[PDB]
Amino acid sequence: MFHTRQLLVFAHSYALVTLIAEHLADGALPPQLLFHYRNLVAVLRLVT
Amino acid sequence: DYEETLRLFKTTVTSPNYPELCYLVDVLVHGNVDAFLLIRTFVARCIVNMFHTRQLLVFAHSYALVTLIAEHLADGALPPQLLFHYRNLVAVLRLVT
């Protein structure tokens, strides 16, 4: 979906974003797509 | 100007996916030069693989490994970009002192 529609998917839920950041980080995704979810987590920590 | 190396240092150190193998190799080398030299090629392969598939430096958590990589891993088999990040780390250590 990032390559065809140009959007990061599963963003609508906290659980999918957090699980993608945590468990899809040992490979699996290209680094940029991973970094987007890690950045969403970092935004939440920043707000804290 | 060492702020790009320090941005990569920040991302590496604060990243939650930092590989567990680095702590093991850190405790297994514990500052020995000859231990690092015996593990040398393994270390370079880990650095390249984690820079390209993750996006973070490797062994940057520990002073000993950073210094050993800066000094002994400067022949080659490590691309000059990674090597210069490690050089800039030791140069920041030298600047502060």
Q: Quickly count: other Cβ atoms within 10 Å of residue B51's Cβ.
A: 19
Region of residue A23 (phi > 0: left; psi between -120 and 50: alpha; otherwise: beta): alpha
Query: Which of A24, A38, A45 is best to mutate for the B interface (most B CBs within 10 A)?
Result: A38
Chain A residue numbers touching B56 (CB-CB < 8 A): none
A14: exposed, middle or buried (Cβ count in 10 Å: 0-12, 13-18, 19+): exposed
Distance from C-alpha of B97 to C-alpha of B90, rounded to nearest angstrom: 11
- Listed residue (B97, B39, B96) closest to B68, CA to CA: B39
> What does this entry list as its resolution, in Å?
3.3
Chain B residue numbers touching A25 (CB-CB < 8 A): 16-17, 54
Alpha helices in B1-79 (DSSP H): 3-14, 21-29, 33-38, 40-53, 63-72
* Vertex B39 angle, CA B33 and B42, to 5°: 140
Distances (CA, A) of B76 to B11, B22, B45, B62, B86: 25, 21, 12, 22, 14
Token duo for residue B22: 């680095």
